[PDB]
Amino acid sequence: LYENQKLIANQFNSAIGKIQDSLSSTASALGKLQDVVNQNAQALNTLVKQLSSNFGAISSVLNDILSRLDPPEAEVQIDRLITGRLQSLQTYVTQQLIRAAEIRASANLAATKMSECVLGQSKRVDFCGKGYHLMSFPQSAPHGVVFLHVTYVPAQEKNFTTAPAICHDGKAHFPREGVFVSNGTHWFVTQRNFYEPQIITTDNTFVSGNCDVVIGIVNNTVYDPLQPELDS
């Protein structure tokens, strides 16, 4: 990071800009919230529209039926109309509760994503977003939340000839954390998710056993830092 602070900031701000443009370009990029709002309002619209149906009764205007017929027959007529409206309202309520449970599950998922991608850093790949995750910036939205996930993604890779381990005195050498790779004839040890040259020394690697039993090991030098200092 301290090797590339300005570059990190530049990429960050360019990413902010591309987010601005991507959001302001097309409406359907923000789709989930529109889906939920449209589904709710359209279900309610169907509910209110259902009142126009006579359901087999004399008409749909209840006051018209009140004016037309007498109570001894308005009894059965309104009975039919009310049972129809009751059935429609009941199925509306059941579907509303279904979508309420779905939204509740989505809200719990959002709570987890907020408590992990924001209140910490969740190592779980492809939970916060594509690639490794760094942080996330919550933002409000009308009946919904949106996350600006900041991710680390490898961009340019160079393949190298590598080795499972090395042995200097027969005893095998296994990296404390690194990969034994060789740019050319010179071997190097580096962390998995970046390239970093490192002369093989005792700090980068512990020593155990002997290299007869391991597989794919290569003969390579293991320099030491104590010798040059003790030389004087």
Partner: protein
Amino acid sequence: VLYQDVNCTEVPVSNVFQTRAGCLIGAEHVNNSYECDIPIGAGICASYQTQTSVASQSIIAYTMSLGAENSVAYSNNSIAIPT
């Protein structure tokens, strides 16, 4: 128009293309795959193409490419490290 279980001979009683989901009427089949837009069925998936020579507007219906097929070159002692 998409039909489900007609075997497509019964449509009139234009261009017809039959999939495991029935046939389309007025559909240009394209062997050249594409990551598609509007799922139809059995992987067959449709979209709209603006041409320039004949029928400058048309509807294509193609097999759905599952992605840009890439073959990693694995080897026992060949590692790739991002720089």
